[PDB]
C-alpha cells in the first residue's frame, strides 16, 4: 500500500533511531534500496547535452526527500563530467543507490604519522601543506550502476569517498545517518589524494577547501512524498 | 554564500 520511498524512509527510521537489532534492520534497508528504481521517484533518466556547462549553473543538484534527527534522505544528480569531490562523513553511516547512469566511487580512510622529510609530490606542496598531509588508505575504486547493490560507508571504514559521473549524467539516492550537523562537530571536509614522486594501498591525504568549481543547488523532488 | 545543510554540511552554494 505504501510507496517504496515511504517504506524506505520508515525502515531508515527504524534502523538509525551497534545496538541490538541494528544489523537485521540495516540488511532490510539495503534490500529495500536494492529494489528502488528511478521511476519510483518520478525521476526520468537524464542524458548528456553535449554542450559545455555555463558558468552560472551548478555541476550537481540535490533533491531533498526527508530528514529526521536520525537520517537524511535525498537524491544527488550529477551532470556529465562532474564529481562530488573526495570528502568525509565524521561519525556517520551512509548508503548510496544509483538511479541512472554510471558512477565511479573511490573509497578511502584516514589512518598520526608525519610525512617523511624526503617525500615529494607532483604538483609540489607549499610548506604549510607539507605539515598538514596525513596518511590514508585507498580501499576500492569501482563503477556502479542501478544494477549494483547499495554502497555503504560507516564511521570507521570507507568513510572518505569521491563520486564521479562516468560517460554522462548520473544520479543516486543517498541516506546519511545521522545527517551532517556543523554546529555539533559533524561537518563535511574535503580532501586531495596526493601523487608522490594495487588495492588496498597507502596514500597521502590533504584536507582542502571546497573546490571553486564544485557546488550543489537544490531542485524540486518530483516523487511520492514521505509523510509523518 | 555558506549554507548549513543536512546532506553536505557547511556548503558554499555558489
Ligand atoms: Co558522501
Numbering used by the authors:
A (entry chain A): 6 to 22, 43 to 136, 144 to 229, 240 to 270
B (entry chain B): 1 to 14
Question: What did the publication describing this PDB structure actually write?
Answer:
They regulate the O2-dependent stability of proteins bearing an N-terminal cysteine residue through the N-degron pathway. In animals, the Cys branch of the N-degron pathway is regulated by the NCO 2-aminoethanethiol dioxygenase (ADO), which also plays a role in cysteamine catabolism and taurine biosynthesis.
A crystal structure of ADO in complex with CP6 was obtained through co-crystallisation to characterise its binding mode and evaluate how differences in CP sequence can influence the means of inhibition. However, two crystal structures of unbound ADO, which were published during this investigation, highlighted alterations that result in an amenable crystallisation construct, including metal cofactor substitution and surface Cys mutations. The peptide sits across one end of the DSBH core of ADO, blocking the active site entrance. CP6 binding is mediated by a number of intermolecular interactions, including pi-stacking between the sidechain of CP6-W7 and the sidechain of ADO-Y87, pi-stacking between the C-terminal amide of CP6-C14 and the sidechain of ADO-W257, and hydrogen bonds between the sidechain of CP6-R12 and the backbone carbonyls of ADO-Q252, -A253 and -F256. CP6-K4 and -F6 interact with ADO-D215 and ADO-E92, respectively. While there is no immediate rationale for the functional contribution of the former, CP6-F6 promotes formation of a hydrogen bonding network down to the active site via ADO-E92, -H89, -Y87 and a water molecule, which is not present in the peptide-free structure.
